[PDB]
Nucleic acid binder design. Sequence first.
RNA 1: AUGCUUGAGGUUCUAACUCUGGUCCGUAAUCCGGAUCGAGGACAGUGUAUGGUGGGCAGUUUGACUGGGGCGGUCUCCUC
RNA 2: UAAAAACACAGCACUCUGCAAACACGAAAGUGGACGUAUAGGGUGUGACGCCUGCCCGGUGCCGGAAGGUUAAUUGAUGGG
Lengths: 136, 272, 77
Amino acid sequence: MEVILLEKVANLGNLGDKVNIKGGYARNFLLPQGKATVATAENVAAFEARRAELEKAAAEKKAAAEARAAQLSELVVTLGAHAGDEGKLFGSIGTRDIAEAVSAAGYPLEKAEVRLPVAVHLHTDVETTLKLIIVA
Amino acid sequence: AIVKCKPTSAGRRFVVKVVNQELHKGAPYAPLLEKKSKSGGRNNNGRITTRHIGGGHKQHYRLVDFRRNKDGIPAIVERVEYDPNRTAHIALLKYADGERRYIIAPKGVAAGDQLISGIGAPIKAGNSMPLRNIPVGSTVHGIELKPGKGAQIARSAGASAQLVAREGAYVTLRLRSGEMRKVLAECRATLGEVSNSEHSLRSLGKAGATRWRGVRPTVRGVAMNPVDHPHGGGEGRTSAGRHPVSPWGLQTKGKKTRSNKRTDNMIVRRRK
Amino acid sequence: SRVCQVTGKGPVTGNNISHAHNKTRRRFLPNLQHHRFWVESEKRFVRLRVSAKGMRIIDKRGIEAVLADLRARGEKF
RNA sequence: AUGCUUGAGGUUCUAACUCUGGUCCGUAAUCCGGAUCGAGGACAGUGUAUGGUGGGCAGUUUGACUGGGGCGGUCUCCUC
RNA sequence: UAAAAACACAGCACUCUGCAAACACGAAAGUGGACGUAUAGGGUGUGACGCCUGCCCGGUGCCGGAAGGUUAAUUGAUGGG
Ligand SMILES: [Mg+2]
Ligand SMILES: [Mg+2]
Ligand SMILES: [Mg+2]
Ligand SMILES: [Mg+2]
Ligand SMILES: [Mg+2]
Ligand SMILES: [Mg+2]
Ligand SMILES: [Mg+2]
Ligand SMILES: [Mg+2]
Ligand SMILES: [Mg+2]
Ligand SMILES: [Mg+2]
Ligand SMILES: [Mg+2]
């Protein structure tokens, strides 16, 4: 399945390269979310008609990513929820309700890639090692 | 509380009854009752599909609260009742807000006891909490499998499970079957053993008592004709004449029948 | 029923033939699967029951052209 | 051997897929569908192809002669 | 035309089944099992109770193992036209 990219993917992302991928990589991940588009012999024609105005935007969203990742890299924001122990609380210490904790002291910081299986991820080449402290 | 009957008549000889005088002598709690009409173990299609079912006593179903999800609010046991639906006893919790509920009675729980469920529940043998808050080595019953689905595993009279290991997101339990199973640590369980552990000591004494419980007679396959059963046939009394099988031909001495590949990762070690 | 919503493939009959050439009536069923297809112009997921050939047609023609044919064919998704 | 086409096991991830798990809505509703959370997870499951197993079920076969039939013997060829 | 010594039975034992259970009826959806959860449910045999239930795993079945041999669809090296 020949597709051309819109955003850059981690392994094969050249943002417009003729990439041959399994049919399940597209149709289930890339096309629905939006990270690429099928080459229909005209999408590539219309990609150059929009590449000039899109790669500058892609840098701009990337530029805002590092600015936001570095602006709020020194917060020690603490929750006021009831807890039983530092690590074993009455609720759940996870990326489910901390959105309002960081939004009240700066950027909203919508939680989509705050990895915690506190390194928050926001772009392919941008990642911040935030540290969360909770009083218990 | 095991009582052997005197042989005043045939049919009373060998009757051993469990008589619990601490059970409630009155009516069950009406708001928690519900109609339960019998099947003769019969299908959607009206077909049997499960033999030896029929003709017991009329029973109300008791709405037992298997998801003890009223976290934080304490409860008073205040009653232990007989349930015709299960071999365990049930306890009518009265919560601090006045709400009344039915739960499977734990072993030592009597009227007036204080039970609580939640994260911070004290570790005593009536309380309910997620399995991650239960210390390794505890004896538990009424264990969830899916968070929010309710208690499913150790529910019959005297039932209990052993919390043996605790990994990251899963907890290993030792079931009374002897199987080692993985359960999500987010799932809730109740500490202690289920009540009515002496239920196994009872002896029905007569054919009628089995009929009282809605169990129709079992006819042996070797007593039939070959058209009815694989074991049927034979002049005079004969054995199965073949490797023993069900009436549908499935071997019934060994011959494991589990075919669930989806859940196989949850079984650490297998025993039945 | 066991009909593909895209191609209209349905169960067909035929024979099982043994080595001794005993013929047994059999069926051939389509490779039907349930699949959710993203529709950008509706910002919605449309769940269809398609054969695997019907999914290839959607790859070749797109879900928009396929769904338009579904509307004209009458039966809805 | 930097790098390069692609087989087979294992471990992770989620995004297909599954849920006879929670919540919300249609909605006056234990069905259903949608949204969402959670759990599995490219497994399971289904189609198709294929090996095994399979009296659970089916269609059938299971000779003739013969001092009745069965049992035993015989069945073609050569010589008296 | 057989009421029995037959069937059932309480009790016993073996075996399967971790729950979307095994199993059963259903092309399926679904349903029973069961609004039950191994002290439960199914199948099999024996048949209150008392004393007991010995030896054989070669055959067949079932269970466990996987070093080796053999082995399907498939793939298509090579040779011959
Ligand atoms: Mg019996
Ligand atoms: Mg019997
Ligand atoms: Mg008979
Ligand atoms: Mg038969
Ligand atoms: Mg005999
Ligand atoms: Mg498969
Ligand atoms: Mg036959
Ligand atoms: Mg005929
Ligand atoms: Mg003859
Ligand atoms: Mg008579
Ligand atoms: Mg007998």
